C-alpha cells in the first residue's frame, strides 16, 4: 500500500515495491505476472515526482541523477549536457501513488541529508 503498489511501467502493468532492507533504499517494479522487473535506487534518484491534485492522472516518476562525470557530445564530438533520466510508474489511484510517492520522497529527503 505504501512501500508497495501495482504500477504500470512503460505501458506494461506490474507492481512496485519500495524496500528498505536493501542497499540504498530501492524500489522494485515487478510485473504482475512476474515476468519483467525494474529496480530503482532512491539514492541514484535526484528527485521523485508524482501527480498533483491539479493533475488529472495518478502517476509517479523517479528522476535519476544525470551523469556529470563525463559530459556527453554530439555526432561530431561537440558537447551536450544530458537531461537526467527518469523512471516513471503509472498508477490508477492518486492515494496509492501518494502513498508510494511519500514513501520514496522520505527516502530521497533522507539521502539528500546525506548527499
Amino acid at each position: 500500500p505504501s512501500h508497495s503498489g501495482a504500477a504500470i511501467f512503460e505501458k506494461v502493468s506490474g507492481i512496485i515495491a519500495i524496500n528498505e532492507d536493501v542497499s540504498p533504499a530501492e524500489l522494485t517494479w515487478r510485473s504482475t505476472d512476474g515476468d519483467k522487473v525494474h529496480t530503482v535506487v532512491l539514492s541514484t534518484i535526484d528527485k521523485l515526482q508524482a501527480t498533483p491534485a491539479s493533475s488529472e492522472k495518478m502517476m509517479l516518476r523517479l528522476i535519476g541523477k544525470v551523469d556529470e562525470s563525463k559530459k556527453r557530445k554530439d555526432n561530431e564530438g561537440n558537447e551536450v549536457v544530458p537531461k537526467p533520466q527518469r523512471h516513471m510508474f503509472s498508477f490508477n489511484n492518486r492515494t496509492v501513488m501518494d502513498n508510494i510517492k511519500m514513501t520514496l520522497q522520505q527516502i530521497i529527503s533522507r539521502y539528500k541529508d546525506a548527499d
Binding site: 528527485k47 501527480t51 492522472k57 502517476m59 510517492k101 520522497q105
Partner: peptide
C-alpha cells in the same frame, strides 16, 4: 515545444512534460 519562434516553449515543454509535482 520546439524553438525558433515567438513565445516558444523550448525546455519548458520537457519540464512540464511530466505533469507531476515533487514533494520535498
Amino acid at each position: 515545444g520546439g524553438g525558433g519562434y515567438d513565445v516558444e516553449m523550448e525546455s519548458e515543454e520537457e519540464s512540464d512534460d511530466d505533469g507531476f509535482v515533487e514533494v520535498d
